[PDB]
């Protein structure tokens, strides 16, 4: 009948509980259509509705804002605001539209005519934070079956008859009482969060096949060994993340398997989506990896009532990585940010998405961050590849223009199912050298693959496979210290003391001075202190810094007064600036009342706020923020669609983020 | 599994009897694809095949050409080339791609596992080429109920007790009988076409929901009124258009009730799109509308064997307009123009696309043109809204950009489904002299909807309506000499007359030297005369021409030597330079050879044309066409993908043309 398509746009696409949520539909129709509307809900219902009749959840309409008619198709946009709500709520929201005076209706995306088969649209309702924890956290990404084999009682799967070709891709032994052995040498590499791959009882070694939500296989060891590991590394102040596989289980999962054989008379049949042809649905057409339903009412109450807190709540992980977050739904992501925020807001979630970092913000408001493969894909190009540096800056520049700054975005080199940088910069580790220090003095969570610090990389050439080419990627852990790059993980050790003793290295705004291919120099800015970066992949040259200002390299105590530098032929340094900058101790508001109104700051955060200000909705507001009587924030804008008493403030890490909040 | 993705990209998209037709995929996947193919048919036959096994046609392997991993999805190019055909064949052909040692295949665009429900793509093998005679043809689009009432006995569905407001969307009496009465007036307009609306026999007065394909509703006449009509229409060497309506039927189409009754067991159920809940594919959800499937097999033999020729062999008729164009299939208009371009190939074959420019020209070598919605979407906004007249030189521009030189732009100011365009001006029949003198001056097939040369405008506004807002645009035909505007009709007799005497108007190409908004003046090129046009629908202004040249005012013969000119105030005059232009005499062709070749002219084409040379395969040539010594093309390039002996060809019209045909 027509093309409604509203694609998840709404207007303040992270919602405070103060705004209104603009919901614009575009739609292209051949007869009429005159309203629609919206049919959303507060709990966590399921939204449906029918031309102005909500029958679970309450209505708002859609209204014609424009139209015409272009090649002999009309374009109407229709609009709506779902009124604000209180903080902590899930809303979902299904849109269709209509014409008055007709006969049915038609819903958003889908173009379905009924409610059941429509795209169901959500957002979260909060003060949209990631933990701070997190943000500072240096990450050691263990995968299990091939770190440590603390007990070798617990390998029932391990066939050592089996060659290197044949075990890589089957049971090697590595288990969580290995994790426990080896946590002191975790904690001595100086890295204060612990990712573990994930332990499903499943039939391969990966963990990725579940069988079991809520049960540890054995071939790991047992919850009271993982218990103690997480107990033992919370002693020593480090915070542990399990590697979640929500999407999808094994065909030999019994829920699977029971409704197998017993179809629709199975509790477990609309708990996958099976087709009416045996067909069902899966992951990228593997038959062993059916999707797991989590739309499914009484599933999505499974994963988030019974299997989420198993391990955030009952075992007492600090935190979840989100194998394929693309598979679930976004109204389950909503779902799910309420249940693990509830548990405690400094639980960190953050997930696995295959695709643009276009795609991958529509993440943000839901979880706490995602794995950077722009990071990994613009620096195997750049210092395995031998690239342009301005690759590396021009990832860094649109990360900040595209990602909420709450977003955390983890950055790693390797990963269990990409080649290691040591193989694809051709074992050369002053290339890999570059890369862990260029990455330690770059804004994000840097993530450590387990085994790069001591130059663990691949003992044969995956292009010379097939579908197991990720055996090379996933080699056991050497414990060796003549087979270990002492050299390397010395120079893991300082780039992380670094990076944990200097806020602005974490935590700090990025801004790039001079750039070459092969050489690069930027600075790390922050209210505390200021540090300048140079690493150079080529040959030795010069770059041009902006200011002049003398410097100390931290590594040789040495200090440097100059407005250039000659960084030198694949090395690299960061230099401290010495400046006695005057801090923050006075903030006014010059643009909303006829005289400055000074703001008054709060220690608990790092904000300076006002006071309480009345404003007329849709009152265009033009103000700045003035610095101890010097400086001015270059002028901001704002309207307040609903209410009158809204607040202002000033966050100094992100001034120019127009904040009025209420 | 992956996302194989093809969406018609076929480099050579309107293939010649000569050059091979590479075909390139572009396929993101999970696991591996190591190799795909090509199953293309010549016959009329549905091509299909599996994993490198054709099952109905050829086979065509398909190769990885690029690859990478990007976000951990991995991005392969698959390339391969289907065979050059012979002149007039039809090409069909399905696309697979699969993993070597693998199980099972994937297929383009519906991402199928089966060839049956995978896309079907299509071109015309074939030197395309439309209708000289639609090029110059001047359209006289007529409702056929709205025009004259030749006979009221053939009225047995006017209800003369109604309303206008009720009678306008019902029958009025309109009948074939009266265009051979008003033949006379048609023939002195001018225009050497005529466009009849559909006559199907239908429940509806203007015959787009036909119940019976091959037959005359008896409200407009018989068969024999119709090819009374055509023959004494050819006998005044005019032509006759059908308004043809391929797409749909009505739920009163015989067909459809039978297999609406007897189900599967109907010898239609298949001729249409029948759902497994009782739902059915439909036109924009219209349930009285049932879309017809030519996409199957007998239905397409139902529509090419028996109906196409009724009306084009049987009927006479000298071409078909084609109401949706874009219901059927790609692969069914291949089909469509194999069947049509036999029984004659100057039959003019031009649909009604609703869509933008860049999707029409994927109807090129399919169809010989279409309805330029773009001229008429952006001739409102500019000469009825007061727009810009650089939107009418920017959409002028746009269509020699973008479409093939063979490709007809049928224009228009109204339609049957837009308001009238008196009607959007205000009735200011000032505005539209300027619209129809613009439009006469313009490139493209002028088309004149039935009423606009006499006044013929709205008796009612359409936005107060609703459903049937189409009443106004098809009133009735106004004859009495007082109530017609024979000021407009004096005027479209001259705009015609001017343009089928000066082939400059039809046929030439365009430039654009000065324009402003209300202001505008352009020329038309060609090779045997010059043509310059002046427009202005404000204030008196001047327009700078580029060079300086003496003309002549076509209406009153007079001249004038000048740089400039003062354009009047809603006025407009077309201008003949008068230039002794040396035409041309001798063209050399330099760059193939060490020494300039001579190329000799045919006369019975218009272009000078090379002797026989031969040319290596992806050899990048680069040459230039010389004229009487004097001036030259600026450098081409061309690539022989396959063969020798191939021969250049210059068409003077089409210099910059690299047609480096066999
Ligand atoms: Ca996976
Ligand atoms: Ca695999
Ligand atoms: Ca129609
Ligand atoms: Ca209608």
């Given at each position: 009948?027509?093309?409604?398509?509203?694609?998840?746009?709404?207007?303040?696409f992270?919602?405070?509980?103060?705004?209104?949520?603009?919901?614009?539909?575009?739609?292209?129709?051949?007869?009429?259509?005159?309203?629609?509307?919206?049919?959303?809900?507060?709990?966590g219902?399921?939204?449906?509705?029918?031309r102005?009749?909500?029958?679970?959840?309450?209505?708002s309409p859609?209204?014609?804002?424009?139209?015409?008619?272009?090649?002999?198709?009309?374009?109407?946009?229709?609009?709506?605001?779902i009124?604000?709500?209180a903080?902590?709520?899930?809303?979902?929201?299904?849109?269709?539209?209509?014409?008055?005076?007709?006969?049915?209706s038609?819903?958003?995306?889908?173009?379905?005519?009924?409610?059941?088969?429509?795209?169901?649209?959500?957002?979260?309702?909060?003060?949209?934070?990631?933990?701070?924890?997190?943000?500072?956290?240096?990450?050691?990404?263990?995968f299990?079956?091939?770190?440590?084999?603390?007990?070798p009682?617990?390998?029932?799967?391990?066939?050592?008859?089996?060659?290197?070709?044949?075990?890589?891709?089957?049971?090697?032994?590595?288990?969580?009482?290995?994790?426990?052995?080896?946590?002191?040498?975790?904690?001595?590499?100086?890295?204060?969060?612990?990712?573990?791959?994930?332990?499903?009882?499943?039939?391969?070694?990966?963990?990725?096949?579940?069988?079991?939500?809520?049960?540890?296989?054995?071939?790991?060891?047992?919850?009271?060994?993982?218990?103690?590991?997480?107990?033992?590394?919370?002693?020593?102040?480090?915070?542990?993340?399990?590697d979640?596989?929500?999407?999808?289980?094994?065909?030999?999962?019994?829920f699977?398997?029971?409704?197998?054989?017993?179809?629709?008379?199975?509790?477990?049949?609309?708990?996958?989506?099976?087709?009416?042809?045996?067909?069902?649905?899966?992951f990228?057409?593997?038959?062993?990896?059916?999707?797991?339903?989590?739309?499914?009412?009484?599933?999505?109450?499974?994963?988030?009532?019974?299997?989420?807190?198993?391990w955030?709540?009952?075992?007492?992980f600090?935190?979840?990585?989100?194998?394929?977050?693309?598979?679930?739904?976004?109204?389950?992501?909503?779902?799910?940010?309420?249940?693990?925020?509830?548990?405690?807001?400094?639980?960190?979630?953050?997930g696995?998405?295959?695709?643009?970092?276009?795609?991958i913000?529509?993440?943000?408001?839901?979880?706490?961050?995602?794995?950077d493969?722009?990071?990994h894909?613009?620096?195997?190009?750049?210092?395995?590849?031998?690239?342009?540096?301005?690759?590396?800056?021009?990832?860094?520049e649109?990360?900040?223009?595209?990602?909420?700054?709450?977003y955390?975005?983890?950055?790693?080199?390797?990963?269990?199912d990409?080649?290691?940088?040591?193989?694809?910069?051709?074992?050369?580790?002053?290339?890999?050298?570059?890369?862990?220090?260029?990455?330690?003095?770059?804004?994000?969570?840097?993530?450590?693959?387990?085994?790069?610090?001591?130059?663990?990389?691949?003992?044969?050439?995956?292009?010379?496979?097939?579908?197991?080419?990720?055996?090379?990627?996933?080699?056991?852990?050497?414990?060796?210290?003549?087979?270990?790059?002492?050299?390397?993980?010395?120079?893991?050790?300082?780039?992380?003391?670094?990076?944990?003793?200097?806020?602005?290295?974490?935590?700090?705004?990025?801004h790039?001075?001079?750039?070459?291919?092969?050489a690069?120099?930027?600075?790390?800015?922050?209210?505390?202190?200021?540090?300048?970066?140079?690493?150079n992949?080529?040959?030795?040259?010069?770059?041009?810094?902006?200011?002049?200002?003398?410097?100390?390299?931290?590594?040789?105590?040495?200090?440097?007064?100059?407005?250039?530098?000659?960084?030198?032929?694949?090395?690299?340094?960061?230099?401290?600036?010495?400046?006695?900058?005057?801090?923050?101790?006075?903030?006014?508001?010059?643009?909303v009342?006829?005289?400055?109104?000074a703001?008054s700051?709060?220690?608990?955060?790092?904000?300076?706020?006002?006071?309480?200000?009345?404003?007329?909705?849709?009152?265009?507001?033009?103000?700045?923020?003035?610095?101890?009587?010097?400086?001015?924030?270059?002028e901001?804008?704002?309207?307040?669609?609903?209410?009158?008493?809204?607040?202002?403030?000033?966050?100094?890490?992100?001034?120019?983020?127009?904040?009025v909040?209420?």
């Amino acid at each position: 009948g027509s093309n409604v398509s509203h694609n998840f746009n709404h207007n303040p696409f992270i919602p405070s509980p103060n705004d209104d949520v603009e919901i614009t539909v575009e739609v292209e129709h051949y007869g009429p259509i005159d309203e629609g509307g919206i049919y959303f809900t507060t709990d966590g219902s399921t939204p449906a509705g029918a031309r102005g009749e909500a029958s679970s959840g309450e209505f708002s309409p859609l209204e014609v804002v424009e139209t015409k008619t272009e090649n002999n198709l009309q374009r109407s946009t229709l609009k709506g605001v779902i009124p604000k709500q209180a903080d902590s709520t899930p809303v979902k929201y299904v849109v269709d539209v209509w014409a008055a005076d007709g006969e049915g209706s038609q819903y958003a995306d889908t173009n379905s005519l009924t409610s059941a088969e429509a795209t169901e649209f959500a957002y979260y309702v909060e003060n949209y934070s990631s933990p701070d924890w997190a943000k500072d956290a240096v990450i050691y990404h263990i995968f299990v079956d091939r770190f440590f084999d603390g007990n070798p009682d617990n390998n029932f799967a391990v066939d050592p008859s089996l060659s290197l070709e044949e075990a890589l891709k089957d049971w090697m032994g590595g288990d969580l009482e290995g994790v426990l052995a080896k946590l002191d040498y975790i904690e001595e590499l100086g890295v204060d969060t612990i990712w573990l791959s994930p332990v499903f009882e499943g039939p391969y070694s990966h963990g990725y096949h579940p069988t079991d939500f809520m049960g540890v296989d054995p071939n790991f060891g047992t919850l009271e060994v993982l218990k103690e590991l997480i107990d033992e590394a919370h002693d020593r102040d480090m915070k542990v993340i399990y590697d979640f596989v929500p999407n999808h289980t094994s065909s030999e999962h019994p829920f699977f398997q029971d409704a197998l054989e017993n179809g629709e008379d199975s509790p477990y049949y609309d708990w996958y989506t099976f087709y009416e042809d045996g067909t069902y649905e899966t992951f990228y057409g593997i038959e062993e990896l059916p999707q797991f339903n989590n739309d499914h009412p009484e599933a999505c109450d499974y994963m988030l009532n019974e299997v989420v807190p198993f391990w955030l709540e009952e075992l007492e992980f600090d935190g979840l990585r989100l194998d394929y977050a693309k598979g679930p739904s976004y109204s389950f992501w909503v779902d799910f940010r309420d249940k693990v925020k509830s548990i405690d807001p400094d639980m960190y979630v953050f997930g696995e998405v295959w695709d643009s970092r276009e795609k991958i913000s529509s993440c943000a408001g839901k979880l706490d961050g995602s794995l950077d493969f722009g990071f990994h894909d613009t620096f195997k190009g750049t210092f395995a590849f031998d690239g342009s540096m301005q690759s590396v800056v021009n990832y860094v520049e649109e990360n900040e223009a595209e990602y909420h700054p709450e977003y955390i975005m983890t950055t790693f080199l390797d990963n269990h199912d990409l080649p290691r940088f040591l193989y694809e910069a051709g074992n050369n580790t002053d290339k890999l050298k570059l890369a862990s220090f260029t990455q330690f003095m770059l804004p994000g969570s840097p993530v450590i693959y387990y085994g790069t610090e001591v130059g663990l990389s691949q003992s044969a050439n995956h292009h010379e496979f097939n579908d197991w080419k990720d055996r090379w990627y996933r080699e056991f852990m050497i414990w060796d210290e003549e087979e270990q790059d002492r050299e390397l993980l010395t120079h893991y050790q300082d780039i992380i003391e670094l990076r944990q003793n200097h806020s602005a290295l974490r935590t700090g705004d990025f801004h790039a001075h001079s750039a070459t291919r092969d050489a690069l120099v930027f600075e790390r800015s922050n209210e505390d202190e200021r540090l300048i970066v140079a690493v150079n992949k080529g040959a030795e040259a010069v770059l041009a810094i902006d200011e002049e200002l003398e410097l100390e390299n931290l590594v040789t105590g040495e200090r440097m007064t100059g407005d250039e530098l000659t960084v030198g032929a694949n090395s690299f340094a960061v230099y401290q600036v010495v400046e006695e900058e005057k801090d923050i101790e006075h903030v006014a508001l010059r643009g909303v009342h006829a005289q400055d109104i000074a703001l008054s700051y709060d220690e608990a955060a790092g904000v300076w706020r006002s006071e309480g200000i009345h404003l007329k909705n849709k009152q265009k507001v033009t103000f700045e923020y003035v610095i101890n009587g010097a400086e001015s924030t270059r002028e901001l804008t704002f309207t307040p669609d609903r209410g009158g008493k809204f607040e202002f403030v000033f966050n100094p890490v992100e001034p120019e983020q127009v904040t009025v909040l209420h």
